[PDB]
Design a binder for these strands. Structure first.
Ligand SMILES: N[C@@H](Cc1c[nH]c2ccccc12)C(=O)O
Ligand SMILES: [Mg+2]
Ligand SMILES: [Mg+2]
Ligand SMILES: [Mg+2]
Ligand SMILES: [Mg+2]
Ligand SMILES: [Mg+2]
Ligand SMILES: [Mg+2]
Ligand SMILES: [Mg+2]
Ligand SMILES: [Mg+2]
Ligand SMILES: [Mg+2]
Ligand SMILES: [Mg+2]
Ligand SMILES: [Mg+2]
Ligand SMILES: [Mg+2]
Ligand SMILES: [Mg+2]
Ligand SMILES: [Mg+2]
Ligand SMILES: [Mg+2]
Ligand SMILES: [Mg+2]
Ligand SMILES: [Mg+2]
Ligand SMILES: [Mg+2]
Ligand SMILES: [Mg+2]
Ligand SMILES: [Mg+2]
Ligand SMILES: [Mg+2]
Ligand SMILES: [Mg+2]
Ligand SMILES: [Mg+2]
Ligand SMILES: [Mg+2]
Ligand SMILES: [Mg+2]
Ligand SMILES: [Mg+2]
Ligand SMILES: [Mg+2]
Ligand SMILES: [Mg+2]
Ligand SMILES: [Mg+2]
Ligand SMILES: [Mg+2]
Ligand SMILES: [Mg+2]
Ligand SMILES: [Mg+2]
Ligand SMILES: [Mg+2]
Ligand SMILES: [Mg+2]
Ligand SMILES: [Mg+2]
Ligand SMILES: [Mg+2]
Ligand SMILES: [Mg+2]
Ligand SMILES: [Mg+2]
Ligand SMILES: [Mg+2]
Ligand SMILES: [Mg+2]
Ligand SMILES: [Mg+2]
Ligand SMILES: [Mg+2]
Ligand SMILES: [Mg+2]
Ligand SMILES: [Mg+2]
Ligand SMILES: [Mg+2]
Ligand SMILES: [Mg+2]
Ligand SMILES: [Mg+2]
Ligand SMILES: [Mg+2]
Ligand SMILES: [Mg+2]
Ligand SMILES: [Mg+2]
Ligand SMILES: [Mg+2]
Ligand SMILES: [Mg+2]
Ligand SMILES: [Mg+2]
Ligand SMILES: [Mg+2]
Ligand SMILES: [Mg+2]
Ligand SMILES: [Mg+2]
Ligand SMILES: [Mg+2]
Ligand SMILES: [Mg+2]
Ligand SMILES: [Mg+2]
Lengths: 46, 102, 93, 62, 77, 16
RNA sequence: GCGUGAUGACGAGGCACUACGGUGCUGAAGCAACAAAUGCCCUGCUUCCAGGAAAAGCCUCUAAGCAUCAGGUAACAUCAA
RNA sequence: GAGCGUUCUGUAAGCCUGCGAAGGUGUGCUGUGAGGCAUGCUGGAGGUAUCAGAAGUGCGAAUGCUGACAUAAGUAACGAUAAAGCGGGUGAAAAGCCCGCUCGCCGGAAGACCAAGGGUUCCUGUCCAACGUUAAUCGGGGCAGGGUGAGUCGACCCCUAAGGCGAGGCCGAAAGGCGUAGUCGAUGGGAAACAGGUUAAUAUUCCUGUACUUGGUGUUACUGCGAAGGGGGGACGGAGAAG
RNA sequence: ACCGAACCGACUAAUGUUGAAAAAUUAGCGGAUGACUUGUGGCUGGGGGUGAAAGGCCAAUCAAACCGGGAGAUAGCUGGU
RNA sequence: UAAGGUGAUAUGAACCGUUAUAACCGGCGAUUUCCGAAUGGGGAAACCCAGUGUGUUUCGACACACUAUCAUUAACUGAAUCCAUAGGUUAAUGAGGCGAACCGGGGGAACUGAAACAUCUAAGUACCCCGAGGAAAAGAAAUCAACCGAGAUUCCCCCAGUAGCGGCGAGCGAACGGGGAGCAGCCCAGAGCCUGAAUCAGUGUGUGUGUUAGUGGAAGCGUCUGGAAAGGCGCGCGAUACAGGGUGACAGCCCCGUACACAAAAAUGCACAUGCUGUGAGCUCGAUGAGUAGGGCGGGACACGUGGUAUCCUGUCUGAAUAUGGGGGGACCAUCCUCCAAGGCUAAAUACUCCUGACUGACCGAUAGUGAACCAGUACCGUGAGGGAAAGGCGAAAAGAACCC
């Protein structure tokens, strides 16, 4: 059966990547929340 | 400065071998000294063909506390305590109890 | 012009292997481990001026790191570049 | 090494740097080829190259 | 934005209060109009987004005075 | 999660 | 399609070792007829209505400008990718 | 209404304790009860009288929370009904690994090459703890070493679609919404390499043979060159039929 | 338009139901040049989208997604104490 | 400052150093790849592609520097349009982004309570956004009071759960006045004598006090048990030091320390004193913030829910007096009292703790205390926002079991 995750690196990076996070104003808030928590990996790029 | 240094004559205050005298070989960073012929342990050395292929049991010296070893006066013939003074700009070490400079 | 500073920095090490030895004994090719930010012209100039031989062409490839386990702690051996340098039939390092 | 390196002029410093870099390259190739039991030479040459760069920057005055 | 250039009037919030006093939020908007004022000092027409209260202030004070005030506050026209 | 015979309707609504 | 590339390469096998896994040497014929694509000519031709991307590379014409200079075309050499 | 116990504070730099503390496990005595006291064995360094003081103060239930361990139970199952047999080798041991001879299954796939996706699973040496629904000498497992070679393939690059962002700008309590010039964005348009051979593992990349493309420089000859502008081209549907 | 593979779908029956599978297998079944199907990419956002309309679908969740927050909502109810 | 040292798991190899270039600690400097506001263009973050100007070439090329946008100012240039403006180019200065909380402002819920619910409460709370600071805000009476007076703002304790508001329900809830903490006043709306004088900022210079490294720092032996003495017993000593930690069991006298006394080449904070720059004080005369106060309509804030409703704010429409005047004194009028709006600046008392040092605890002790005592925001889970663990202890010292079956 076709499941919900059909992966693609290009769509992954355009959706959740660092440059899209910096592009939207609330994405920068997301990065602030993750840095304040102390995540090893902020976005899906690494 | 350190009150007990390398190559001193020291006498053991407390331990297995109280009263024995010896010469300090080297001083470790963790506040422990190795005094020659004092704290003997029986190591079971594992023989290695790459290096040191003989085996056998080997009796070596283990570390003893710098608090446990005390400097040896050799004039009064007993243990002593070391203070610090300034003589001609140099910080020198001297036995208390007759105040003789080492 | 490429500076001697740059050349002495870019050449890193020789490479030893069965394939490298076969390349040396068959096609007059040496295999060199090279710093990653070095280009083909930089490797050619460095070999030509430091080993005092003459180079036909140079071929580069980036060797990827290896994921290793050290006591159930994952680690990653790093990348480097490898260079196959072809010599003109009469050098014989 | 610092004072006698400081008592040299700029051209002497540059050719000293080039000689040190040549020695660094030779030591690196030897150690990679499976020679050079003495690694303190590697450390010493690296730190001396750093010293020569420091004196070059001071003599340029930045 | 619906901000008067002369008097600085901007929308403010209040309530709709009905006969049963049910309070719901609403905005009071200024009576803004874009008017071309003839300035004589420059022999020019300057267009300003100004309320009618602002127009009364214009007519009382003189267009030159309020243009100086606008230039002091820094907004362009 | 849940058993299919508990999600089913003909056997769950057995005594209406 | 034909000629050249090709007196080349490849070639069933045969011969000898083998760490029996595979290597080293040599090597004849190497054409014709017929059938045949959903592939090519074909981004074609015929027809239909539902009327079937854009911009650059490419060719070409001049403005401002340069005007026996730059620049362009054609050959050769060298370098670079 | 009256009390037992537990943790901590004062009395306490006191009292007990390496001639054995707390804790654990038995025994004996004792109180109306919660409990107390003494001691054997394990333990191996702390415990605390008495009278007061403060409470994270007492668990069998909450389809309670977390770990451990039973039960059904050595039971169901061991994942396509394409199928195995034998001889030799290695090994401590072979139904499964290697080699051979048969037998069977697929063969518009259960064969060969890629894109997407993954990341060393590729090849060699060694090991069988754990993983593999059995065993294991085997493995896509552990460990170590090797391996990916480009002017021509693909990206990068030039150019645009849908769409995105968008200097100025128009608009909006603020944040922001839209949008012109621009600038990104392939799934599309744009130059050029083929045959043979080789490695345990790469090849249109290495080698042999024979080619091709674009751009810069420098000689030779002739000469009106030049765009962000004009034109052509690139440049386009469905079906069908035949050579 | 017709018959029929690829491909798309899902009418009937058996198996399975702590499954080989949180929707399949087997044997038959319907469309199969069109209102077709498919790859890559883009757009529409929660009282909102999209809907050849079933309250269907929006990441195994839909008469109002998921995540964090007001929040220890409230509970004249049940359990435990 | 030193006789040892080259960070940890983590040994080993090669070495450096022992009286002063080893190492360690502190001040000042140097280098500081790439991404990131990211700032030369672009981008699927850590990558791709340049333009311009110098300088070097072995003629293949290479090194360095600059080039974002916006705001202000200045120069040059410049349309429809004749001057001018709009625009363009350059130069200089400034900004952008990150950060736990506190602070001012613009917006602003609902569950809930009312034993239902709608005015009301929750609540101007949560949350979103903007801006600033070491604090912010407020602030020098068009304030209160009561015929007596007080004298800016802020914060704590009373007044007082009072007066009041209130489907007069649920609930909300002052002020006057009193006791304290802390105290500070000024400037423009304008002319003249006068000298640049008080007071503030930057930049230096001296004196103290610190901060960032550090130095010295007292006084115990014998014996018994014991693996080991710091324990038992006997006998001494120090104390401006019996705070604390370690040492083979519980140490004032073994070690690190503590009380105490000192120490700074260099950088920097504060309080003074003193130069330069900028700024002006003193006296006399004059002036006294207009689409404003007030009013009509709609709302909001005051404990005050339009009520008999004073007062403040303003979306819309109007609109004075102006010192011979005006505001307030809780509908409103008259008398009296008290103050002077329509400009602004100002320390302290006050609020908080991402961070730094010391000390404390009738606080916890590995299912507790942080989610995390351990390589924890990790493994793992989800497309993503996000969720989110488990896991401490040999011994005093590895003496971590040579060798044989
Ligand atoms: N029992 C069937 C069908 C099924 C699946 N999920 C269900 C939920 C409810 C009722 C039936 C089902 C199965 O396991 O496949
Ligand atoms: Mg080549
Ligand atoms: Mg390559
Ligand atoms: Mg066909
Ligand atoms: Mg206890
Ligand atoms: Mg006690
Ligand atoms: Mg309890
Ligand atoms: Mg229990
Ligand atoms: Mg019970
Ligand atoms: Mg049974
Ligand atoms: Mg049975
Ligand atoms: Mg069975
Ligand atoms: Mg099977
Ligand atoms: Mg067999
Ligand atoms: Mg089998
Ligand atoms: Mg076989
Ligand atoms: Mg068959
Ligand atoms: Mg692996
Ligand atoms: Mg394999
Ligand atoms: Mg076995
Ligand atoms: Mg097994
Ligand atoms: Mg493997
Ligand atoms: Mg576009
Ligand atoms: Mg803009
Ligand atoms: Mg837009
Ligand atoms: Mg483009
Ligand atoms: Mg493409
Ligand atoms: Mg292969
Ligand atoms: Mg049909
Ligand atoms: Mg369907
Ligand atoms: Mg059905
Ligand atoms: Mg079927
Ligand atoms: Mg049909
Ligand atoms: Mg059909
Ligand atoms: Mg219905
Ligand atoms: Mg779903
Ligand atoms: Mg709802
Ligand atoms: Mg609440
Ligand atoms: Mg609850
Ligand atoms: Mg950018
Ligand atoms: Mg950039
Ligand atoms: Mg670009
Ligand atoms: Mg800022
Ligand atoms: Mg409600
Ligand atoms: Mg209610
Ligand atoms: Mg209720
Ligand atoms: Mg202030
Ligand atoms: Mg008076
Ligand atoms: Mg000292
Ligand atoms: Mg001392
Ligand atoms: Mg004693
Ligand atoms: Mg003990
Ligand atoms: Mg006034
Ligand atoms: Mg008014
Ligand atoms: Mg009124
Ligand atoms: Mg008034
Ligand atoms: Mg009044
Ligand atoms: Mg814990
Ligand atoms: Mg425990
Ligand atoms: Mg993941």
């Amino acid at each position: 059966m076709k499941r919900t995750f059909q992966p693609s690196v290009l769509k992954r990076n355009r959706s959740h990547g660092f440059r899209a996070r910096m592009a939207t104003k609330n994405g920068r808030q997301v990065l602030a929340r993750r840095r304040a928590k102390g995540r090893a990996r902020l976005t899906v790029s690494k | 400065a350190a009150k007990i240094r390398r190559d001193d004559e020291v006498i053991v205050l407390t331990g297995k071998d109280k009263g024995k005298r010896g010469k300090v070989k080297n001083v470790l960073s963790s506040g422990k000294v190795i005094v020659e012929g004092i704290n003997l342990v029986k190591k079971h050395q594992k023989p290695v063909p790459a290096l040191n292929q003989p085996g056998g049991i080997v009796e070596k010296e283990a570390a003893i506390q710098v608090s446990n070893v005390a400097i040896f006066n050799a004039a009064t013939g007993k243990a002593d305590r070391v203070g610090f003074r300034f003589e001609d700009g140099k910080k020198v070490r001297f036995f208390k109890s007759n105040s003789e400079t080492i | 012009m490429i500076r001697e500073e740059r050349l002495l920095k870019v050449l890193r090490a020789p490479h030893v292997s069965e394939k490298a030895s076969t390349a040396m004994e068959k096609s007059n090719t040496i295999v060199l481990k090279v710093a990653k930010d070095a280009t083909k012209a930089e490797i050619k100039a460095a070999v030509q001026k430091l080993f005092e031989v003459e180079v036909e062409v140079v071929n580069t490839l980036v060797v990827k790191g290896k994921v290793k386990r050290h006591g159930q702690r994952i680690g990653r051996r790093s990348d480097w570049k490898k260079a196959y340098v072809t010599l003109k039939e009469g050098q014989n390092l | 090494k610092a004072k006698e390196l400081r008592e040299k002029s700029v051209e002497e410093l540059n050719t000293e740097l080039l000689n040190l870099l040549r020695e660094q390259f030779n030591l690196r190739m030897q150690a990679a080829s499976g020679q050079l039991q003495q690694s303190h030479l590697l450390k010493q040459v690296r730190r001396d190259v750093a010293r020569v760069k420091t004196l070059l920057n001071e003599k340029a005055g930045a | 934005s619906r901000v008067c250039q002369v008097t600085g009037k901007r929308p403010v919030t209040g309530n709709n209060r009905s006969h049963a006093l049910n309070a719901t939020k609403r905005r009071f908007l200024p009576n803004l109009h874009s008017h071309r004022f003839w300035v004589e000092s420059e022999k020019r027409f300057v267009t300003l987004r100004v309320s009618a209260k602002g127009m009364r202030v214009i007519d009382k004070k003189g267009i030159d005075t309020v243009l100086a005030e606008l230039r002091a506050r820094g907004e362009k026209y | 999660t849940s058993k299919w015979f508990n999600i089913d309707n003909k056997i769950v609504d057995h005594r209406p």
